[PDB]
């Protein structure tokens, strides 16, 4: 479902535009937060040890 949408509206786009758009939307921040959580899980195990 995601693929169809990307092809439909974002085919005529450049990476610089994509990054700018994603930041304005705030989608990028969310991805970062998920990654941070994953690091946190590893960190917790280390602290316990």
């Amino acid at each position: 479902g995601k693929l169809k949408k990307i092809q439909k509206k974002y085919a005529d786009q450049d990476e610089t535009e994509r990054l700018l758009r994603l930041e304005a939307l705030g989608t990028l921040k969310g991805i970062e937060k998920q990654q941070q959580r994953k690091k946190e899980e590893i960190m917790k195990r280390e602290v316990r040890e």
């Binding site: 005529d12 786009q13 450049d14 535009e17 304005a24 939307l25």
Partner: protein, 246 residues
Amino acid sequence: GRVIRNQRKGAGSIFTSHTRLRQGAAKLRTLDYAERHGYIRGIVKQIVHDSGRGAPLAKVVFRDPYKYRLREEIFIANEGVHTGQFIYAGKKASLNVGNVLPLGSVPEGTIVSNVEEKPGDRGALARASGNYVIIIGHNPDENKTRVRLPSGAKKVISSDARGVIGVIAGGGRVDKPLLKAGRAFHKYRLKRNSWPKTRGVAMNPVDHPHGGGNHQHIGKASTISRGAVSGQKAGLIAARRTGLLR
């Protein structure tokens, strides 16, 4: 409830555009044989004012290559075009302001206007006063050109589409304050019936979603879904964000 005003606008009873004093559709010359194998020379006879349009128009006269007669096209005047100027339209036309070169034959950084979307619709992009299209890049294999539009968008259109070199005349118009409801009246009097505008929050609830209440307030959120139906789409339709950014 009643049928709301923007719902009523689509019937086109009193909401049609006032087109009595307009001088014709401002289109490019049709892409017959001369414009795609060579060029053709016409003459600017007069630059005139178009009712309901911020930009002036140019009346360019060409000769019909197949019959002894004269053709008169209405171009949108570029800033710098004068009366008596020779206008060159075609594939082999030289790169000067007012010429009607196709987009495949202009280099990087060229500023054009009255750009066709597909080759042959005789002008679609950058037609209002002061607007222009910049050529951002070429692609010879799978022959396309990237262009920057007046909205800041980047389109990838065919390299056989045509465009008039330069910017549309009459720019800087909206920098002057209107100062007067009479001036806004005379502005929209030759466009269409859209002014004055009553705030839907100042209506009765039969007339608008925003109407009613013992205080003038909207009630629910003013951001409206794209999947909403007619009579509901009153407000900010499909807003990704709201508010004044700093």
